[PDB]
Amino acid sequence: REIITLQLGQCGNQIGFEFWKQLCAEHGISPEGIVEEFTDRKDVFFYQYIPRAVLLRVIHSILNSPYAKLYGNNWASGFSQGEKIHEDIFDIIDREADGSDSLEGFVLCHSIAGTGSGLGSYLLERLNDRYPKKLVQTYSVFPVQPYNSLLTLKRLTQNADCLVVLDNTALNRIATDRLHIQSFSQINQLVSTIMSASTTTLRYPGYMNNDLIGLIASLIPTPRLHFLMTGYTPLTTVLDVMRRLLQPKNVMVSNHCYIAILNIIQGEVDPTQVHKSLQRIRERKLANFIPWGPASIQVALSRKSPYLRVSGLMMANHTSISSLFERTCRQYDKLRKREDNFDEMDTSREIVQQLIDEYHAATRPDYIS
Amino acid sequence: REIITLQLGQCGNQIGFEFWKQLCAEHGISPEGIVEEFTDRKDVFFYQYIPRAVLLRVIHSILNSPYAKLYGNNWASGFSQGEKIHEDIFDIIDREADGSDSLEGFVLCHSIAGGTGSGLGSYLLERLNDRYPKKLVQTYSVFPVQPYNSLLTLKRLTQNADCLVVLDNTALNRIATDRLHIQSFSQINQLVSTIMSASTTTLRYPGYMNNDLIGLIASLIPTPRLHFLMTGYTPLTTVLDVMRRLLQPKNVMVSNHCYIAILNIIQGEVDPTQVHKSLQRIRERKLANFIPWGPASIQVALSRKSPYLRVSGLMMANHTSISSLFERTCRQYDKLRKREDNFDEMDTSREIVQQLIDEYHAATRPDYIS
Amino acid sequence: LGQGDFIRHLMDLLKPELVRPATTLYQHNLTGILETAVRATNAQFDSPEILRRLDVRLLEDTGWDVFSLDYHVDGPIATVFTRECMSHYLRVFNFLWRAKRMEYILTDIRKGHMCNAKLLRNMPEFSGVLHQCHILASEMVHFIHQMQYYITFEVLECSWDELWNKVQQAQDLDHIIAAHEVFLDTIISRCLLDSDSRALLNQLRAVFDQIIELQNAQDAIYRAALEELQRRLQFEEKKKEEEEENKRIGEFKESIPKMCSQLRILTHFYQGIVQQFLVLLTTDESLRFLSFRLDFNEHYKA
Amino acid sequence: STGKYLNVVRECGEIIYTLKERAYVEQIEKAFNYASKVLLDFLMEEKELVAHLRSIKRYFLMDQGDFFVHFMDLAEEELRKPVEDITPPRLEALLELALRMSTANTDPFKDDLKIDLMPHDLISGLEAFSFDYIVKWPLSLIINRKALTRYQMLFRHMFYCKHVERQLCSVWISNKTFAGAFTLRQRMLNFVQNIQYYMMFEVMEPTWHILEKNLKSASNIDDVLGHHTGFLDTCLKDCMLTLLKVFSKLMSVCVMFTNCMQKFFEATINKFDKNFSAHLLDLLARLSIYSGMASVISRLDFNGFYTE
Ligand SMILES: Nc1nc2c(ncn2[C@@H]2O[C@H](COP(=O)(O)OP(=O)(O)O)[C@@H](O)[C@H]2O)c(=O)[nH]1
Ligand SMILES: Nc1nc2c(ncn2[C@@H]2O[C@H](COP(=O)(O)OP(=O)(O)O)[C@@H](O)[C@H]2O)c(=O)[nH]1
């Protein structure tokens, strides 16, 4: 099962270009697409080695970079032009699909803040037409700006089978708090750390989680509550790492309860004190979950690349993600009272309200019905 | 059995010259056509040493090359000029033919994209089908007013040439930009000559099987119509890795569907006991599909690399997807037919290529018979 | 037959001779042909000593049933072969000679069809029955062109490797005899020339026979179409009467469904002897690698 | 124990009597202490037993993930067929192709995996599949048919739990473009993926981690033969393999519920709920009544749910 990734807009290119650089080094692969001599499953993202990427003036910046041998501002402009090249970019994706053994997903990296917004809205619609059995995960990045942002949310709530939020605001704080930057060339270094460590269980096979649909169906219980946030502590036992992930200082997000937690421990920690910490987290009650359904916390170990110390990443499905929407929803109405049908915006307006209500209904002891 | 090759047009002449350079380098033959001191059966392509070539401006470039000691743009113009000098070129062809002990075939290397080479090769194919009825004709044709010439060449190639190997410049340029980082003719021609030299490997280094051209042809081509093949060259280590990298669409030189016949040539010093395990695991994992009507299998053969010159491999496939390419040309012809003595030959060409595309599309059905 | 280059030329020169019955065949004539092949192919660049022993012998029908090479060896080297390795090689050489003429027949037919359709491509009423002549060929050449690979890779290249490995390390000339004696007990076993695998080889011979019957029922259907084509050429070139030929052309179309019932019953019996052949392989272990070669993509076994 | 070590190495590649003085008793030890040091080192550097047990663990305990997600994906249609209907020449051809295409290609001992269709189930077609491992003579003293079927008893119990939540997670995409079954799928998925985690990282792993260290301080073969069967009787005890047949019937409603959803009623989804939830509560009732076998409850429920 192979995962063909997409990169749209200046954001998607920059994070993806730095995502591949983090992966190319984590394996024994020279930037010349040649394996270095110097066990790790590398067929998912690489084709025997060439990465399975379909990019879409930053492109020239990549073609001049040493990695050259490895391959307007309106939302309407993005959706319009995307229709004019419907056959062009689908020729590439189709020829890249059948050449692969068995396609599994479409990890799409785009920012909802110019053309990446309108084009990505076009793709996520068109993929569900032709490919109805392919998961579509998206590493969307949060920042007329209120308009282009929410319009993509209309598509991301009914097409994308998963979504990982990464807002630049909360990232900028961690850029200022523990890195003291005051720049895009620095915050993306943290984004590339989150994207690479997200698929560490696919590239390093273990007991479980050897396929993308194994990481998805565990967290997302229902087709609607499909938004996830991340947590990465290293910026020492398993109890030291588990306690730091639950602190609000580490989450990349600016009653409320969790739905499902998955912990990624990339250390060499002995697998015997893994149940003791989980036992302790239950006692001190450092996190609460949904009251209606049985919600449990899962922890997964892996092995660090010898070619490159305990780290940790947490995939979270938290109801407090509804706050980020309200900030978009709020500023929209203000721009709606300040200035061929203008119905798509209002129709998108309604469905976002259905989503936020579903979150605030998820924290109720009677979320069923 | 001796194979005589012909080179027409600029593209054909250049690729043939580079192929001869590669083959002379593979053996111990100096550019001065003198054997160097420094097992390899070389009688097929060389005459005791002189190559069996018939070249037909770039000839001056070859004559200025260190290898001098080794020897309009319309289709109708090419056909007319080829008709004008029938006897002149055919005297050369006949003397080189009857001079040989036992002729076997006529390798033709030319570009059907356009110019005079297209029509000249058309005329030569017709006249060779006329005169010699017992000689196989293989063609290393290269794919790109262009649609007109291309479709006419396809019309003449779908009934005369007993085999054919396609080479699209688009896929070659794609591979060059991907894994060679060129941005040129003199660079893609390197890969072209590599594929060509590796194509006739089993004829020069004798093995258990495949000692003659019929051994290569009759295995793949099941019916006289489905005679278009595609190539794949993975090394740009076990045989399983080679076979898994070969069947990837990333390497095939091509821009439901299934396979008709597959042939693998392995030139390495690998252990020949793991090949059956490789085929077993390939069948297990189900990486490729076959025709549903007839029993079609994949054949694999080994050889030896030139010691005077590591594990490599090449793959020759009979895939029904190739028809797609023709469609494009066909499509363009229609677009050219509605935008602008009898002009009926082009219509007959369109008719027969439509027949061929329909036959390809029907080949992938469980009741292809009848 | 490990040379390939030499045996190819040798099968082209013995073709006009062996077609005659054995009574008109005398050994003193064939030697000049064998000597000619060794001079033409790459076998000329070879040690003169080993070429002094390579000769012919006539087994005691047709010329394709009594021809075989001998390579007699006498002297000190004769204590390694001991008159039994020379009685096993000829027991093997027959199986490699048959499986070599059953292939050069099927590349001659496949050569005829490439020059066949280049002539009679103007008779759209004949391609309906000519098609069954192609499919039966491409279904028959697979069974043979696949068995050739099992002979090369799983019998020769594999069982010889276990011999050259137990020779460059053996010594005292008694680990060489025992390594060369078992090298002739696996080839007899991996090929179907065993004693208890008799039911398998006689089953294979029937498939070897069906290849010949096709080559006899093909040229009959092939030539019968060239005569009617040649008459149709002269019946119009000299004049450019009309009613006396339409009955000849009309009856010629009526004989076509008769020939179609031949290739429809020849094929339906060829598949009945192969689908029976596979069942006999499930009997003694290396034969399993043959069942996969034939049954690739499961063209049989439904 | 001295000469026997000398023979399993040879075939592959002065003492006087005194009374009241033990000039020979010490002499035997100075040779036995070398008789072992040549054999033990022979197994760690060249043909690297400990480097032989790890290979068995990859397939029998399903440690290697890339090999199973690619094998069941290829050999599923050919396993749902009933027993005495599938040709072993068809499975083994897929097993060989499953290993090489995966990342298990870097395994010297991979060529000892054989298919073995058991006649009885875990007291057909899918419930009658299990690997078999053939070993040579000198190692057959440790891992033998008596102590290999145990590896084959705790394998099927893990190939079943890996199969259900492989297809239960497969229906997850079919429904995603009548709406009350999503909260029931949550009740079974959070049960198998809460048993598998306890079964892989807190049961066999801990025991395996001990065995590896417990074989560095070995002194004689009849001790290694104790640290091994002392590891298999613990895995079969900490797991539910030793009775607790309520798990067997509990799995039936999970796999069958996948069939109902695969037929695309509203009175049948709620029928599975009252049937599965009742079966689950029978488990935690018996898992709690004992003298780990108690920490499993903390893995099943984490939110205080199922407090009835
Ligand atoms: N996190 C992050 N976000 C970025 C980066 N570069 C651009 N962005 C986001 O992308 C948005 C601008 O998108 P833009 O480049 O105009 O899209 P385009 O019109 O398709 O080129 C801004 O709102 C940023 O938030 C980066 O390096 N890191
Ligand atoms: N692949 C490849 N194609 C070539 C090369 N040189 C020329 N061609 C093709 O040949 C065509 C031009 O043919 P041309 O020389 O005009 O034919 P002429 O008019 O008979 O001389 C172009 O469309 C090219 O695609 C080469 O080096 N490599």
From Swiss-Prot, chain B:
Which cellular compartments is it found in?
Cytoplasm, Cytoskeleton, Microtubule organizing center, Centrosome; Cytoplasm, Cytoskeleton, Spindle
Molecular function (Gene Ontology), one example: identical protein binding
- Xref: InterPro entries: Gamma_tubulin (IPR002454), Tub_FtsZ_C (IPR008280), Tubulin (IPR000217), Tubulin/FtsZ-like_C (IPR037103), Tubulin/FtsZ_2-layer-sand-dom (IPR018316), Tubulin/FtsZ_GTPase_sf (IPR036525), Tubulin_C (IPR023123), Tubulin_CS (IPR017975)
Q: Specify where it is mainly localized.
A: cytoplasm
Q: How is it modified after translation?
A: Phosphorylation at Ser-102 by BRSK1 regulates centrosome duplication, possibly by mediating relocation of gamma-tubulin and its associated proteins from the cytoplasm to the centrosome.
Indicate the segments annotated as coiled coil, or none if absent. none
Q: Which amino acids does the record list as binding GTP?
A: A113, G114, G115, T116, G117, S118, G119
Record PROSITE patterns: TUBULIN
UniProt modified residues of type Phosphoserine: S102
Q: Name a single GO cellular component.
A: cytoplasmic microtubule
Q: What subunit structure does UniProt give?
A: Component of the gamma-tubulin ring complex (gTuRC) consisting of TUBGCP2, TUBGCP3, TUBGCP4, TUBGCP5 and TUBGCP6 and gamma-tubulin TUBG1 or TUBG2. TUBGCP2, TUBGCP3, TUBGCP4, TUBGCP5 and TUBGCP6 assemble in a 5:5:2:1:1 stoichiometry; each is associated with a gamma-tubulin, thereby arranging 14 gamma-tubulins in a helical manner. Gamma-tubulin at the first position is blocked by TUBGCP3 at the last position, allowing 13 protafilaments to grow into a microtubule.
Linked pathology: Cortical dysplasia, complex, with other brain malformations 4: A disorder of aberrant neuronal migration and disturbed axonal guidance. Clinical features include early-onset seizures, microcephaly, spastic tetraplegia, and various malformations of cortical development, such as agyria, posterior or frontal pachygyria, thick cortex, and subcortical band heterotopia and thin corpus callosum in some patients.
Q: What is this protein called?
A: Tubulin gamma-1 chain
Organism from which the protein derives: Homo sapiens (Human)
Curated annotation (Swiss-Prot), chain C:
Domain of life, source organism: Eukaryota
Subcellular location(s) of the protein: Cytoplasm, Cytoskeleton, Microtubule organizing center, Centrosome
Q: In which tissues is it expressed?
A: Ubiquitously expressed.
User: How would you summarize the oligomeric state and partners of this protein?
Assistant: Component of the gamma-tubulin ring complex (gTuRC) consisting of TUBGCP2, TUBGCP3, TUBGCP4, TUBGCP5 and TUBGCP6 and gamma-tubulin TUBG1 or TUBG2. TUBGCP2, TUBGCP3, TUBGCP4, TUBGCP5 and TUBGCP6 assemble in a 5:5:2:1:1 stoichiometry; each is associated with a gamma-tubulin, thereby arranging 14 gamma-tubulins in a helical manner. Gamma-tubulin at the first position is blocked by TUBGCP3 at the last position, allowing 13 protafilaments to grow into a microtubule.
Q: What does this protein do?
A: Component of the gamma-tubulin ring complex (gTuRC) which mediates microtubule nucleation. The gTuRC regulates the minus-end nucleation of alpha-beta tubulin heterodimers that grow into microtubule protafilaments, a critical step in centrosome duplication and spindle formation.
Family membership: Belongs to the TUBGCP family.
Indicate what this protein is called per its UniProt record. Gamma-tubulin complex component 3
Curated annotation (Swiss-Prot), chain D:
* Effect listed in the UniProt record for changing A128P: In CDCBM15; uncertain significance
In which tissues does this protein get expressed?
Answer: Ubiquitously expressed.
Instruction: Kindly list the places in or outside the cell where this protein is found, as annotated in its UniProt entry.
Output: Cytoplasm, Cytoskeleton, Microtubule organizing center, Centrosome
The UniProt family comment states: Belongs to the TUBGCP family.
Q: Which disease is it linked to?
A: Cortical dysplasia, complex, with other brain malformations 15: An autosomal recessive disorder characterized by global developmental delay, variably impaired intellectual development, speech delay, facial dysmorphism, microcephaly, and varying degrees of cortical malformations including pachygyria, thin corpus callosum and subcortical band heterotopia. Most patients have generalized seizures.
The task this protein performs is described as: Component of the gamma-tubulin ring complex (gTuRC) which mediates microtubule nucleation. The gTuRC regulates the minus-end nucleation of alpha-beta tubulin heterodimers that grow into microtubule protafilaments, a critical step in centrosome duplication and spindle formation. Plays a role in neuronal migration.
Self-association and partners: Component of the gamma-tubulin ring complex (gTuRC) consisting of TUBGCP2, TUBGCP3, TUBGCP4, TUBGCP5 and TUBGCP6 and gamma-tubulin TUBG1 or TUBG2. TUBGCP2, TUBGCP3, TUBGCP4, TUBGCP5 and TUBGCP6 assemble in a 5:5:2:1:1 stoichiometry; each is associated with a gamma-tubulin, thereby arranging 14 gamma-tubulins in a helical manner. Gamma-tubulin at the first position is blocked by TUBGCP3 at the last position, allowing 13 protafilaments to grow into a microtubule.
* Descriptive protein name: Gamma-tubulin complex component 2
What is the organism field in this record? Homo sapiens
Which residues of the entire protein appear here: the answer is 452 to 867 of 902
